[PDB]
Structure formats: structure tokens, C-alpha cells
């Protein structure tokens, strides 16, 4: 045949892959964590968005830390041979490096490790996408008025917010980040490479949202999401 290029992931396997959505809204009272109003709006938007991208979506609600780990372990032991990619969306409270089960925290690194190149062989070389709506600390952005491959290769973490910072969720509309992510996927998934989509999400969150609060400490604050890419190829959700 003629000259070939392989700058982009193979996305024409029989299946796009799983989209696991962990929607933690209600937490055990002993944790003292508040209910995450608006997260169901997020979970529904994601389900529909990834459905239209032809992902096999599985929604899970209010999982304990044990259930999260067991789920990730189990999913990582499925046969993904006929799948192009893997997507996991986490909606919860969080801190840097951490997301909360309903009864306590889970290490993000622990979750992604199940899908390591050496630990999930049917996903080796395929894009493994983790989308995380959760705080990463308690900073507020005040804004300004204008042979082998690495086992950690082919991961992408799309964080809702910068490291160290709160992440914002609207109780009526859903979270700024997930709102924006679904909108940009709907508008551009048939047009743009995924980093360029996520860059549009960065701009949308950064420009269109600003907190309103009766509390001066939490009023008029801004947010910028953070793309964490260890991908080795371009990712298009469509194929030729």
C-alpha cells in the first residue's frame, strides 16, 4: 500500500470501550461530607454525551471506598481486546491525589494503577482517560479582570481544577467543568482532536463562570481546569 502515518490512536475497534461514571452524591454521616447537589445533572449529561460517542456507559451511584476499588479491579480484569479506549469519570469530594468514597477516601494513583500497561494487557497501548470532578485542595482563584513502553504511558487525567484548588459545582446546573466538557464534546467530538477539545473546555470554564456567594471568602472566584496528558498519540473519537 501507499505511505502510512500512525500519529493517532486506533479508534476503529469494534467497540469504543467502557465509560464508567462514579456519581457520589450522598456520603455516610460519620464522614461529615455534604451532599453534592447538582451532581445528578452531571451524571446524566455525561451518560448522554458518552452514549452519543458510542461508549458502553455504566453509571454507579454512592459507592464506598471499598466498592470503588473493587469496581476498578473488576473492570481492569475484563477483556478489553475489542475496545478502543477506556474512560472513567469520578464525581465526588476530593483533595490533592484523592477522591472520596461515601465512607472515606481513595488514592487516585491506586485507581489508575489497575489499568497500568503491565496490569491490564488488553488496554496496553490504548488511551485510558480519567475525568475528575472533585476538589484538589482549598485554594480559591481570585481571578484578574481583563521493545517496551512505560507502564504509565497512554493515560490522561482531565482535572476539573488546578492542583491545590477547590472545584466548583452549581446545585442547579451541575459542575462548571462537567457542564463545559459535555458541551464541547457534543460540539466538537466529530471535528477536533481531544487535547484541543479539552483546551476549549479550559477556556469555557475560565471565561464563562464566576462564583456568587453571600460569603466574601467564596464570592467572585474563578476556576481553570488542568489537562494532565501522558498520551503518546492524538485522540479522535471519530474514525475514517
Amino acid at each position: 500500500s501507499g505511505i502510512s502515518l500512525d500519529n493517532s490512536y486506533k479508534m476503529d475497534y469494534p467497540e469504543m470501550g467502557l465509560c464508567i461514571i462514579i456519581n457520589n452524591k450522598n456520603f455516610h454521616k460519620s464522614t461529615g461530607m455534604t451532599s453534592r447537589s447538582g451532581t445528578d445533572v452531571d451524571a446524566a449529561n455525561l451518560r448522554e454525551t458518552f452514549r452519543n460517542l458510542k461508549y458502553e456507559v455504566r453509571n454507579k451511584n454512592d459507592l464506598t471506598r471499598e466498592e470503588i476499588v473493587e469496581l476498578m479491579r473488576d473492570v481492569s480484569k475484563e477483556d478489553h481486546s475489542k475496545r478502543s479506549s477506556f474512560v472513567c469519570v469520578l464525581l465526588s469530594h476530593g483533595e490533592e491525589g484523592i477522591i472520596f468514597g461515601t465512607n472515606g477516601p481513595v488514592d487516585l494513583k491506586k485507581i489508575t494503577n489497575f489499568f497500568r500497561g503491565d496490569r491490564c494487557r488488553s488496554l496496553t497501548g490504548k488511551p485510558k482517560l480519567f475525568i475528575i470532578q472533585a476538589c484538589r485542595g482549598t485554594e480559591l482563584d481570585c481571578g484578574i479582570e481583563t521493545h517496551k513502553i512505560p507502564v504509565e504511558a497512554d493515560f490522561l487525567a482531565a482535572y476539573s481544577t488546578a492542583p491545590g484548588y477547590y472545584s466548583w459545582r452549581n446545585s442547579k446546573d451541575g459542575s462548571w467543568f462537567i457542564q463545559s466538557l459535555c458541551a464541547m464534546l457534543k460540539q466538537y467530538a466529530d471535528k477536533l482532536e481531544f487535547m484541543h477539545i479539552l483546551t476549549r473546555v479550559n477556556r469555557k470554564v475560565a471565561t464563562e463562570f464566576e462564583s456568587f456567594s453571600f460569603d466574601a471568602t467564596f464570592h467572585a472566584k474563578k476556576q481553570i481546569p488542568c489537562i494532565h496528558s501522558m498520551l503518546t498519540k492524538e485522540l479522535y473519537f471519530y474514525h475514517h
Binding site: 476538589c135 466548583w168 462564583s211
Partner: peptide, 4 residues
């Protein structure tokens, strides 16, 4: 608006 609430924080996570």
C-alpha cells in the same frame, strides 16, 4: 455555587 458550592465547592467539592
Amino acid at each position: 455555587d458550592e465547592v467539592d
